[PDB]
Enzyme design. Structure first.
Site, short mmCIF file in Angstrom:
data_model
loop_
_atom_site.label_atom_id
_atom_site.label_comp_id
_atom_site.label_asym_id
_atom_site.label_seq_id
_atom_site.Cartn_x
_atom_site.Cartn_y
_atom_site.Cartn_z
N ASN A 1 47.46 -32.53 23.37
CA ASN A 1 48.05 -31.21 23.32
C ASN A 1 46.94 -30.17 23.47
O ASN A 1 47.19 -28.98 23.62
CB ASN A 1 48.76 -31.03 21.97
CG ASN A 1 47.79 -30.95 20.80
OD1 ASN A 1 46.86 -31.76 20.68
ND2 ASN A 1 48.02 -29.98 19.92
N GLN A 2 45.72 -30.66 23.42
CA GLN A 2 44.51 -29.85 23.52
C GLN A 2 44.48 -28.88 24.72
O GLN A 2 44.84 -29.25 25.84
CB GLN A 2 43.33 -30.82 23.60
CG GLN A 2 42.02 -30.36 22.99
CD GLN A 2 41.06 -31.53 22.78
OE1 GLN A 2 39.89 -31.35 22.43
NE2 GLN A 2 41.56 -32.73 23.00
N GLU A 3 44.07 -27.64 24.47
CA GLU A 3 43.93 -26.62 25.52
C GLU A 3 45.19 -26.17 26.24
O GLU A 3 45.25 -26.22 27.48
CB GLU A 3 42.93 -27.08 26.60
CG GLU A 3 41.44 -26.98 26.24
CD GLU A 3 40.71 -25.86 26.99
OE1 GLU A 3 41.17 -25.48 28.09
OE2 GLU A 3 39.66 -25.37 26.48
N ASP A 4 46.18 -25.70 25.49
CA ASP A 4 47.43 -25.21 26.09
C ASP A 4 48.16 -26.22 26.96
O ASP A 4 48.34 -26.03 28.16
CB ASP A 4 47.16 -23.95 26.92
CG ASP A 4 47.24 -22.69 26.09
OD1 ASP A 4 48.38 -22.28 25.73
OD2 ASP A 4 46.17 -22.11 25.78
N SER A 5 48.59 -27.30 26.33
CA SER A 5 49.33 -28.36 26.98
C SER A 5 49.81 -29.18 25.81
O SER A 5 49.03 -29.50 24.93
CB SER A 5 48.39 -29.17 27.88
OG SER A 5 47.28 -29.65 27.16
#
Ligand SMILES: [Zn+2]
Ligand SMILES: [Zn+2]
Ligand SMILES: [Zn+2]
Lengths: 47, 270, 33, 65, 134
Positions: free
Chosen positions: E1-5
């Site tokens: 989910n890291q970095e806008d995802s």
């Protein structure tokens, strides 16, 4: 029996014909008309 | 006074739930089971739809999808091989159950389609399987879809084995509960608090069944996990109990297949 | 008393049949309400 | 757009419970919040499912062939 | 989910979370050439020309269209058509190379000049995949 073909948008009622046989429906002038499903059986995945 | 280690203590019961206090085991295990129950317990649900005629407003696949979620029976199941393993070119009463379904808009006033309307055609071989699990009040269960005047819908469904790993529809699970050390004598958490940890954070129904803290006492660094308050629900297909034993079982088998491999593996070599 | 061209009319406006129409009329006309 | 068989979140069936809800309202005259509690929808995962669905299907069914 | 995802519960996607639909509308009419030289909607093939396409024409009933139940994919033809010149040059309509699905409903109409106007719809269900955006 009696196989269908096309259909009227409003007065929806099996129709059909072919080249030069006009375009309107055997009633509603509404010159639209759909082609209706295939006798052929479609299939799907239940997911 | 009896039994080895793991020991339940059914707190309550319900045709659709099994609040039990499974105690004395490895958390690992408790979960490992939980998981199994959720996605690997065999079930049965439609997995193939043969739209002959559809005038609905829900395009084919839309319906075809729901049809798969429609919970179907599977008390037995274990006596209905996975179509895949069976030898019948495609499918057969040996591997699958076939259902029918037809609706027409006679009631010029919204005619409804319900799971009840499915019609088992293939030989049920005599065994609880394929019956549209119904927990409806008026006995209709799962409103499939609606239609008007001359709306028609002709189908042919073919339910097969399957498990949640392949898709949810084969989920006998529904939603399990889980919790342990209701006071956190292990500190598996670090309660986020503005002021009073004990205030902001609500206590649990499970506090009772376990001795409260007691300030005086230091900290237990040998603390482990025993007693887990689960609540296996169910959707029907399998009785809330089976969703637990079969869980206890399915898993178990696998845990053995490992030995099975350790054996077959040795025999080999020159 | 002569005729001249065509004025593509705005929908749901005075000169549009829909202006009057309601529920039924629309649904019948297929035109979403 | 027709009831959603089962809940996305957890799965607990919800395709049946539809008609019963709409009734525990226009008829039995209750308040959503309880209506739902009445039909077995405990935790929100399931709750939001019903409470939110918009049965467009009706509006659709009101057209023609 | 890291970095806008994000990570998205698949189990719930199955039960249908975020599934959408998709309809496209390929279309075509019958040209004219004043001298009454007009095109045509048919299911052609050899007929001298060779000027055809590459998608299975089969899925073409005789009106030169596809039945509203068929399952289209590659670039199978969705509208057979021909042009009269000097004798059977193609003008068919293949599918969206990338896209593919099911014919949702075809339709044949006139067209002021009387010409045969035809629009075709292809339905598709798109499920949330890993690359998708929300
Ligand atoms: Zn007509
Ligand atoms: Zn078989
Ligand atoms: Zn839920």
């Amino acid at each position: 029996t009696a196989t269908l073909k096309y259909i009227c948008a409003e007065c929806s009622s099996k129709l059909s014909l072919s080249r030069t046989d006009a375009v309107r429906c055997k009633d509603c002038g509404h010159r639209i008309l759909l082609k209706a499903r295939t006798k052929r059986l479609v299939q799907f995945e239940a997911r | 006074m009896s039994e080895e280690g793991p020991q339940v203590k059914i707190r309550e019961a319900s045709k659709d739930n099994v609040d039990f206090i499974l105690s004395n085991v490895d958390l690992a295990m408790a979960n490992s089971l939980r998981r199994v129950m959720i996605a690997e317990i065999p079930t049965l649900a439609i997995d193939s739809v043969e739209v002959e005629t559809n005038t609905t407003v829900l395009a084919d696949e839309f319906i075809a999808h729901r049809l798969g979620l429609i919970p179907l029976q599977s008390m037995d199941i274990e006596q209905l091989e996975y179509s895949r393993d069976c030898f019948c070119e495609d499918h057969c009463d040996k591997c699958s159950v076939v259902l029918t379904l037809q609706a027409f808009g006679e009631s010029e006033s919204t005619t409804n389609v319900y799971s009840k309307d499915l019609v088992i055609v293939s030989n049920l071989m005599g065994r609880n399987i394929g019956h549209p699990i119904i927990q409806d009040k008026e006995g209709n269960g799962v409103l499939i879809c609606k239609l008007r005047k001359g709306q028609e819908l002709k189908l042919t469904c073919v339910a097969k084995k399957g498990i949640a790993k392949e898709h949810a529809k084969w989920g006998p699970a529904a939603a399990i509960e889980f919790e342990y050390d209701p006071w956190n004598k292990l500190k598996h958490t670090d309660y986020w608090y503005e002021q009073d940890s004990a205030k902001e954070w609500p206590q649990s129904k499970n506090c009772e069944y376990e001795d409260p803290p007691n300030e005086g006492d230091p900290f237990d660094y040998k603390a482990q996990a025993d007693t887990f308050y689960m609540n296996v629900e169910s959707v029907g297909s399998i009785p809330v109990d089976q969703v637990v034993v079969r869980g206890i079982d399915t898993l178990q088998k696998k845990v053995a297949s490992i030995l099975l491999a350790l054996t077959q593996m040795d025999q080999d070599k020159v | 008393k002569v005729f001249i061209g065509r004025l593509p009319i705005m929908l749901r406006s005075k000169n549009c049949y829909l202006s009057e129409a309601t529920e039924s009329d629309l649904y019948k006309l297929k035109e979403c309400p | 757009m027709i009831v959603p068989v089962r809940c996305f979140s957890c799965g607990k069936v919800v395709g049946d419970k539809w008609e019963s809800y709409l009734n525990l309202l226009q008829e039995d005259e209750l308040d959503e919040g309880t209506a739902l509690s009445r039909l077995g929808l405990k935790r929100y995962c399931c709750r939001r499912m019903i409470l939110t669905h918009v049965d467009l299907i009706e509006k659709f069914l009101r057209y023609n062939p | 989910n890291q970095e806008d995802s994000m990570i998205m519960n698949q189990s719930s996607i199955d039960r249908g979370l975020f599934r959408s639909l998709f309809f496209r509308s390929y279309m075509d009419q019958e040209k004219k050439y004043g001298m009454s030289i007009t095109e045509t909607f048919e299911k052609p093939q050899r007929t001298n020309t060779l000027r055809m396409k590459h998608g299975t024409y089969d899925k073409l009933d005789d009106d030169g269209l596809i039945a509203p139940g068929v399952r289209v994919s590659g670039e199978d033809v969705i509208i057979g058509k021909t042009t009269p010149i000097s004798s059977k040059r193609d003008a068919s309509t293949p599918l969206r190379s990338t896209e593919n699905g099911i014919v949702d409903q075809v339709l044949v109409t006139t067209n002021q000049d009387g010409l045969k106007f035809v629009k075709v719809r292809v339905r598709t269900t798109k499920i949330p995949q890993i690359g998708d955006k929300f």
